[PDB]
Every structure is written in structure tokens, then in C-alpha cells.
Amino acid sequence: HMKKVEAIIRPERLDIVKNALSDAGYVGMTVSEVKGRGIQGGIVERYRGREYIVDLLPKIKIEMAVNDEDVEKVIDIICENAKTGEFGDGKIFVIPIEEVVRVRTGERGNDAI
Amino acid sequence: HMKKVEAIIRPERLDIVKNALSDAGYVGMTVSEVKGRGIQGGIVERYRGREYIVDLLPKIKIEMAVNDEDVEKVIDIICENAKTGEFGDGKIFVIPIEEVVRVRTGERGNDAI
Amino acid sequence: HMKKVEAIIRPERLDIVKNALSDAGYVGMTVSEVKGRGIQGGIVERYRGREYIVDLLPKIKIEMAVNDEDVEKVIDIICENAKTGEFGDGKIFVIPIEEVVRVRTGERGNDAI
Ligand SMILES: Nc1ncnc2c1ncn2[C@H]1C[C@H](O)[C@@H](COP(=O)(O)OP(=O)(O)O)O1
Ligand SMILES: Nc1ncnc2c1ncn2[C@H]1C[C@H](O)[C@@H](COP(=O)(O)OP(=O)(O)O)O1
Ligand SMILES: Nc1ncnc2c1ncn2[C@H]1C[C@H](O)[C@@H](COP(=O)(O)OP(=O)(O)O)O1
Ligand SMILES: [Cl-]
Ligand SMILES: [Cl-]
């Protein structure tokens, strides 16, 4: 029934992804700053004449509770606006939610978003 | 069996919510700073004579692994102490956990909390 | 099929845990800074002649999408390298993922990691 869509994306794509989501009626979301490691190349930094590799790079995590019937549309909006063609574009996880409660009213399920 | 309770709430309510949870025996939790977007009004900021809307506002995320039988009590404690009547009070997600392991001992399930 | 491994661990153990994971072929992960409360003792701080207890302590959250068949190996790698014997070593949650999408290509499931 309700699903959590969790996307890890490049920080510079947050504005285009969130504008495309709100334009399609998906305004609600929680956003957090994280770091990610993958196949993308780490960054090279210098310290006292030595170079070192930084393997964890800044990323953005977007979390959205949506009804299952909207999952594929949210996925397609995030993919179209987050992809760049280069390694490090990110992932999207779909995780089951067994209950959504709106703190303010106590509404649940679709009435809670 | 084990569930993850994930609550998004106003930052100024973190102390009252966490005191009410520990008073009821729910001490364990992970807390993180996030930003949220919803029906609540964004904030107005000024920069070089122009006003701009900030749509992502500071929120607090609380995560708690609890046994299913305690979920409704944890939900009610968070709702009573996090609600204010105004838009932006937040959400509570209940997500299945298929395994909980305590790093220190290797205990699992209820012995892992 | 696909599972999310989410580990809460001491910040000073992040390097040893992530080196042991990459050495075993598990490079991909998302890392975030959080605070945690549990049975471990809070910290004592002083402010204007008074002492106060800080109950929420810095922790590190590691998230990894893995195929179910690798979950127990990832758990054992995290436990061996994150445990210290003292209270506050952390937890590991295994959460179902119903869909993993690689933003860059649109690949899913095992081809998405
Ligand atoms: N197994 C995994 N679990 C969770 N997050 C992962 C993951 N593998 C990669 N990530 C996140 C962190 C990375 O910074 C981000 C992009 O990963 P990548 O492997 O560098 O590029 P790409 O996804 O384009 O193949 O996705
Ligand atoms: N679909 C969704 N998925 C995840 N988090 C959401 C969500 N909609 C809202 N949120 C989070 C971020 C918001 O800052 C917070 C409160 O949202 P709101 O819509 O502004 O007020 P309210 O929950 O009182 O209706 O909840
Ligand atoms: N019920 C729960 N839900 C989510 N995270 C928890 C939890 N209980 C504890 N934690 C996280 C935050 C803590 O800082 C960390 C370690 O907890 P602890 O109780 O202090 O030590 P230990 O896990 O060694 O028993 O795990
Ligand atoms: Cl965070
Ligand atoms: Cl989750």
C-alpha cells in the first residue's frame, strides 16, 4: 500500500529533481546530507606535500512516503532529472511502509501524506 | 516482529518528545537533522534587495527499532508531544525490520534493543 | 531479494569498518552523521559553573543495499570491526527493499548495485 521512496543523488541535482517532483504534485519530502562511496572516482586532496584519496563524497538523500500506484512515476521523475551519464548519479530504493501517521491530526495512510 | 519507527518532527519539539519517550521506558533511538518540504509555508529570506522563498525547512528525524506490540504506544507518545495544531508537525512511518543485531554481543531481536 | 543493511556505529570505527567492507568487495554505501541515545552513559558538560548531561552522542549511520545472500557476511564484517566490548557499539537493522534502481542506466535489482 504505502511505500518509502529513498533516492541518493548528486547535490547539484537537488533543485532540478525537487522542482520536477513538485511540478508533478509531489511536494512532500524529507531531505538530508550524506556521503556516498561507489564506483565513481574518489577525490584527490593535498596535505603537507602529500596527496590522499577521499572516498566518501557529498550526496543528497530524498525520502518520500507515496502510495504504491505513484512509485513508478516518482522513480521516472527522479531518474530523468538526476541522471548525468557519469558514474555517481545515485540509487533509488523502494521500501515498504506499514503505517503512516500525520502527527497534527492523527490521520493515517493516504490521508496522512 | 521488529519494526522501525521513524518520526519527522519540528526541531523545537525534540526535547519534549524524547523526555516523554524515555519516561515511558523507550530510551534507545537515533536522531538526525534533516530538512522537510510539505503544505507548511516556506520561509521568506532577503538577499541584495530581493526576497526569495526557502522551501526546505529544518526538521528532526527520530529512528527507533521497537517490538511490534509497542508501536502504537510509541506513536501515541510522539503524537501527543509533537503536535502543535499548525501545519508542519510531521509524519511517523512504521517500517518492517527483518533482523536487529547488537554489535557488542551479537544478540538479535528483542535481546538486541 | 534485496535488503537494506543499516548500521549505527561509533564514529571512531568508521574507517576500520569501511576498509574491511571494501576489502571483501562491498564498496557501495551511503554514510551519515547522526546522534544516538541508549544504555551507554551520556556525556557531562559544564556551563557557567553547572554540570549538565548530554544524552545524544555522535554516531555514524552506514546504509547498504545488498542481495539477501550477502546479508549475514556484511553483518559479520560490521560486528567484528565495530565492536569494542563497551556499551554504545551500536545496532544493525536489515530492512526489505522492494526495488533498487540505478539512476544512471535505469538498471534494477542486482544490476543496480
Ligand atoms: N550498495 C549500495 N548501497 C547504498 N548506497 C549505495 C550503494 N552503492 C552506491 N551507493 C550510493 C552512494 C554512491 O555515492 C552513489 C552512486 O554510486 P556509484 O557506484 O559511485 O555510481 P552509479 O550509481 O552511477 O553506478 O550511490
Ligand atoms: N510524502 C512525504 N514523505 C516524507 N516526508 C514528508 C512527506 N510530506 C511531508 N513530509 C515531512 C516533511 C515536512 O517538513 C513534514 C511536515 O509536512 P507538512 O505537509 O508541511 O505538515 P503536516 O504534516 O502537519 O501536514 O513532514
Ligand atoms: N531502539 C533503538 N532504535 C534505534 N537505535 C538505537 C536503539 N537503541 C540504541 N540505538 C542506537 C543509538 C545508540 O547510540 C547506539 C548504541 O546503543 P547503546 O544502548 O548505548 O549500546 P549497545 O548497543 O552497545 O547496547 O545504538
Ligand atoms: Cl543526516
Ligand atoms: Cl528505511
Numbering used by the authors:
A (entry chain A), B (entry chain A), C (entry chain A): 0 to 112
From the paper:
Unexpectedly, the structure of MtGlnK1 crystallized without ligands contains an additional electron density in the cleft surrounded by the three loops. A 2′-deoxyadenosinediphosphate (dADP) molecule was modelled with high confidence. Since no nucleotide was added during the purification, the metabolite must originate from the E. coli cytoplasm and has been retained during the whole purification. dADP is coordinated by a network of hydrogen bonds from Thr29′, Ile38, Gln39, Gly87, Asp88, Lys90, Ala64′, Arg101′ and Arg103′. This state has a similar nucleotide coordination and T-loop positions compared to the E. coli AmtB-GlnK structure. We suggest that the presence of a dADP rather than ADP is artefactual and we consider that dADP would not influence the T-loop coordination differently compared to ADP. The carboxy group has an equivalent position as the Gln39 side chain in the MtGlnK1-dADP structure. Our studies also highlighted that MtGlnK1 is able to bind a deoxynucleotide without provoking further structural changes. The dADP might come from an artefact during the boiling procedure and its physiological relevance should be investigated in the future. However, our model supports that in the dADP-bound state, the T-loop could in theory block the NH3-channel after slight repositioning as shown in E. coli structures.
